[PDB]
């Protein structure tokens, strides 16, 4: 009933995230 | 649960399973014709006759599925003998197989007839239409050798053969099922597949294990080049179930489809005159070419163990089919629909069918397979042995065949020097697993050593040496008296009133009973057969302790008494009569090394034919042989006996007369070419088994096997050295047997040592 | 999932099986027939219920009844066929209505005209109402000519009925 | 549900054909296109630099 | 004859049991709609 | 055999009687239905007025 | 042997093409009973609101 072992499942691309420039949040808030 | 996809309900007649939606069905087990035996000339004719017989019963009601299921056969069981020599032979010959294919192909065609006090008469009309369709298809498939799957009672539990194939389609392992009052959809599945929701691969769920399977969809439109195009899959290292469906289209529907396709190809922005004219040619080829179109999807479902292994199988299959101009499209999300579309009468779940001409369906699935015989289920236990074949497919040899009770008579035509005796010895040694009585007859001491190794009492003969035969010591039964009378008449003929005298004398005439005593009761003529006469050493012996109860095997050598027309007929009547008296219940066999000399006997031939008619239902297996066919066909009655034979094995005889093989033995011209293609000492032979044939290349040379993780080299050179028989071999064997004793395995090492010394 | 079938009767098993299949198909088609028959009957009672429900609605109540009261005698009258006749009765009563009609129809004041306008329409047959409404239309409309710059004062001197639904107003 | 969803997800896809603009060979060296734009391919052994 | 490739393909693609289940389900749905409509009408009258 | 014959007897008796009662009760329902639900579909009437002179006590109907 | 008919019904209930047939017509029968009951009650309702 579980995903079948050693097959191609969903993509590994959904793990991607958009990086944030680590100054935008603080100064945007202020 | 799972019955939501399986349409099967119950039986309507012995050979027609019904369907939930009232779509009556039938299953045929097609052996298929060999595509190697016949050249490229006859393949087209096969396709044309299949087209003829299909369009003969063409209707919009019909349909056809076709499956090529490949198995790693396990139902072929190991057997334990009761003699060490045969066990040695079996063990080494089985070890000769580590790393081979060991796969069989089975071809199944199913015909489903879905209709599109009236109700009862329509039920009867439907079943009658389907049975007439079955009769026509059976008339068609005579050469292919198909059998109609039908119910078979097993001890009060009625079963149903068609359910087994439909089970193997879904279950993936042959699980027998009974016919019972449910609808078979509820329980026909036992090991239910579990497709991954993304659908790249699958699973199976068995009591004993499991597996993975991915699919391929073979969508091809172009007319095939070869009449069998993708037959490269028939030989591969992976299992599969290749499926085709032919849901016919009514003729107006085909016309309309072709018209719409031509219109939609015309009404485009690019003109391609390589397509429009071809389609327009086909549109009125359909009316005049007389082939009816239909729907067609093709799917290949390779099985495996590891999922990466399944992908490697798919890549190999894709390459091996791009080699034949077809492009496989992998299945990614349609796998569930594809697999549930394999069941016959699952029209609904076909992924994307597209119309295909009838010629192209019969040319994608033309029922070609390398001939492989029956691994088991024979009337005599499993197959005797598993011969190799050119192109690597295991022929499971057996004398059973099918309808040339079960015909078993076998003939082995070929030169004695070129492996005839080795083959006969090997077959008998490995068929010792049946524990049948073998009554061996020999020419030039061919089988003496082999029989004496197998625990027989082979009786070497010899001119001028007391034979030990004394027919007058037989019990005075009505049958024996008749025989003795006939026997003495025959002796007297060598030199009505005579008959009366012989009768009275025999009636009047245990330890004292001899031919010489008979003289005291024609006299002058019988003197030569008595002690002191030219033939006094043969039948006038003091005693005759010679009944078949002591041993199972016996062999009689008449190579001394072969070409001497005085008394072959007497000696053969005596041997045949005494052996025939023993023929009751016991699984039985004869072996004749050469029979055409006893065949020209006037009195003996009629008795042989009548006893054949009586014995065919009594587990009778003649094993005939001949050094060269021209020797056999010289006699007319030999043709009559040859017509009643089951399996023919053909050794390599370059000096083969054209007429003999061509029309005498009902062989093909192409098979005659294959016989000559073998060298002088090729060690291959073409086995025409029934109506299909293959080159069973047997090789008992050096082979490599793995023992305890190390590659060891072994051979059967030793076995063939002890298997064949030569006069020097015979004299060494006789000397040893005379000095050491009787037991079979006590002397064999001594024999090995002496023969090794001879070879040096 | 029971054991195999009784093999002593092959013919009986699939004979009754074909019988059952035919009977099942027949009963299922007959059930479909009764299903649409019941659907039609349900529709018919549904629309009978709807038609009677609408027709019995509280629309069109008892027609208003005037219990005419005589001012001299106190006698009380009742609803009558005067609805399908001249409901207004008596010189005194008719002259009142004729007066109020003319005064309100002919008069004009930006400040009170909405009532006189609606009253005139209330006391006019649709043909008459339209003639009246038109006096307030176009560039020469009373609403533009008089507007809130000028006003009309109307007074009736005398009304005398002369027949069967007809009177003269001076 | 768990049985029919295969076909439901199947038929609701945009095949790659919407994005590949090619069709029958019209000449042995030239490929057509649904918009009738014929093209040819030139394998080149670029000269050394 | 049918003379329509769509008609024959869709005839093959169709099963009797499911079609008749759907037919009777739709008939009962329409009957229920009419019955509820009748109840609505009777409420309106009362 | 016996079980199938009993099931067929229940078929005939109970199902045929169920639909026979369906038909007869539906027909009776139709008769009463048309009848009454047409009856009260026509609106009904109340009393109008009674005269009672306050000065003379005279009653006019 | 009171209600020997119920024992006969149990044999029909056992899963089979015959069980499906029997269950089908009894489902139809109880649908008939339901519709007859609803129509009888609703017709008597119509009569009572009328009267």
Author numbering:
A (entry chain Z): 21 to 50
B (entry chain P): 15 to 130, 147 to 434, 442 to 532, 537 to 550, 557 to 568, 583 to 821
C (entry chain S): 5 to 174
D (entry chain O): 1 to 49
E (entry chain Q): 13 to 58
F (entry chain X): 22 to 82
G (entry chain U): 8 to 58
Sentences from the paper on this structure:
Conjugative type IV secretion systems (T4SS) mediate bacterial conjugation, a process that enables the unidirectional exchange of genetic materials between a donor and a recipient bacterial cell. Bacterial conjugation is the primary means by which antibiotic resistance genes spread among bacterial populations. The recent cryo-electron microscopy (cryo-EM) structure of the conjugative Type 4 Secretion System (T4SS) encoded by the plasmid R388 revealed that the remaining VirB proteins form a large assembly organised into four sub-complexes: the outer membrane core complex (OMCC), the stalk, the arches and the inner membrane complex (IMC). Previously, we solved the cryo-electron microscopy (cryo-EM) structure of a conjugative T4SS. In this article, based on additional data, we present a more complete T4SS cryo-EM structure than that published earlier.
